[PDB]
Design an enzyme around this catalytic site. Structure first.
Site, PDB file in Angstrom:
ATOM      1  CG  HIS A  86      -0.530   0.104   2.530  1.00 21.60           C
ATOM      2  ND1 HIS A  86      -0.041  -0.976   3.232  1.00 21.60           N
ATOM      3  CD2 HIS A  86      -0.451   1.151   3.402  1.00 21.60           C
ATOM      4  CE1 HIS A  86       0.295  -0.589   4.436  1.00 21.60           C
ATOM      5  NE2 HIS A  86       0.061   0.700   4.582  1.00 21.60           N
ATOM      6  CG  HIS A  88       0.385   4.275   4.921  1.00 17.46           C
ATOM      7  ND1 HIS A  88      -0.427   3.563   5.796  1.00 17.46           N
ATOM      8  CD2 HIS A  88      -0.299   5.389   4.569  1.00 17.46           C
ATOM      9  CE1 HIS A  88      -1.552   4.230   5.929  1.00 17.46           C
ATOM     10  NE2 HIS A  88      -1.492   5.346   5.218  1.00 17.46           N
ATOM     11  CG  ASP A  90       4.373   1.040   6.882  1.00 23.15           C
ATOM     12  OD1 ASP A  90       3.689   1.860   6.249  1.00 23.15           O
ATOM     13  OD2 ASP A  90       3.894   0.084   7.552  1.00 23.15           O
ATOM     14  CG  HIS A 151      -3.572  -0.447   7.225  1.00 21.07           C
ATOM     15  ND1 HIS A 151      -3.289   0.045   8.475  1.00 21.07           N
ATOM     16  CD2 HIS A 151      -2.683   0.115   6.385  1.00 21.07           C
ATOM     17  CE1 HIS A 151      -2.234   0.854   8.367  1.00 21.07           C
ATOM     18  NE2 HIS A 151      -1.838   0.916   7.106  1.00 21.07           N
ATOM     19  CG  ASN A 182      -1.504   5.522  11.033  1.00 19.15           C
ATOM     20  OD1 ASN A 182      -2.606   6.061  10.805  1.00 19.15           O
ATOM     21  ND2 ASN A 182      -0.321   6.206  10.954  1.00 19.15           N
TER      22      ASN A 182
END
Ligand code: XMZ
Ligand code: ZN
Ligand code: ZN
Length: 233
Positions: A86, A88, A90, A151, A182
């Site tokens: 995804h 983000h 990270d 998420h 998050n």
């Protein structure tokens, strides 16, 4: 760590550790700070003949450089492709390092648009065939699966059929998690439905790897649903 699953307390500053999950399957673990808190995060490495497929960066440019060095030391096969699960940091933070090291970087069009809008690094290549919940495509030694929004709206999961390894990414939490993590980009209402889809599609999974924290078995899926439902309420 000496064979235990790596945690922030056993990764030296700036470094990455690998963990053997199965034959030809490793996780990678690194540490990063964000908003003044320190977090671990995982990714995956899958042997693809005499090459490697990487799933997710090590959360940052320097961590990702360290990841490539650790792979060279521990495995010694070239990383030729990477998938980000995804948008983000990270997952994509370090894509520019990968791209300058000769790695071809991939993500869904949804991830690429979100990363661009957010100011995050952008994988080069678009993964079509993943836009509808329940979609699956092959990518080297893995299957990529879009379970629906969880998420994030773009989150992908990765299955390694040769090993029955399910890499849930940040849609799946570790068993010790008490919170939904998050949730800024999450769909709390759809997340349990998306997890149910994962459970239905991959009932033979033997190892489940979360985006952050310790791997386990299939129970991570139901635990995730439970934690998210409790958070939403
Ligand atoms: C805000 C609280 O977030 C958490 C709380 N507890 C555990 C985790 C793993 C997180 C967390 C997650 C995740 O849940 O996937 N992603 C994060 C990012 C991205 C956007 C780069 C930054 C900072 C923290 C997290
Ligand atoms: Zn995320
Ligand atoms: Zn995450």
């Amino acid at each position: 760590p000496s064979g235990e699953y790596p945690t922030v307390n056993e990764i030296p500053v700036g470094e990455v550790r690998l963990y053997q999950i199965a034959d030809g399957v490793w996780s990678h673990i690194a540490t990063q700070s964000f908003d003044g808190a320190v977090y671990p995060s995982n990714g995956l490495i899958v042997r693809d003949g005499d090459e490697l497929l990487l799933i997710d960066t090590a959360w940052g440019a320097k961590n990702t450089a360290a990841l490539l060095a650790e792979i060279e030391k521990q495995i010694g096969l070239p990383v030729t492709r990477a998938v980000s699960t995804h948008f983000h940091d990270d997952r994509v933070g370090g894509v520019d390092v990968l791209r300058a090291a000769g790695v071809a970087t991939y993500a869904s069009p949804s991830t690429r648009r979100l990363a661009e809008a957010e100011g995050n690094e952008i994988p080069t290549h678009s993964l079509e065939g993943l836009s509808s919940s329940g979609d699956a495509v092959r990518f080297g030694p893995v299957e990529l699966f879009y379970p629906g929004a969880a998420h994030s709206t773009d989150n992908l999961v990765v299955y390694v059929p040769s090993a029955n390894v399910l890499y849930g990414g940040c849609a799946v939490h570790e068993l010790s998690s008490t919170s939904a993590g998050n949730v800024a980009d999450a769909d709390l209402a759809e997340w349990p439905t998306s997890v149910e889809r994962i459970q239905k599609h991959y009932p033979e999974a033997e190892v489940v790897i979360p985006g952050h924290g310790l791997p386990g078995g299939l129970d991570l899926l139901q635990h995730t649903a439970n934690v998210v439902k409790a958070h939403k309420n």
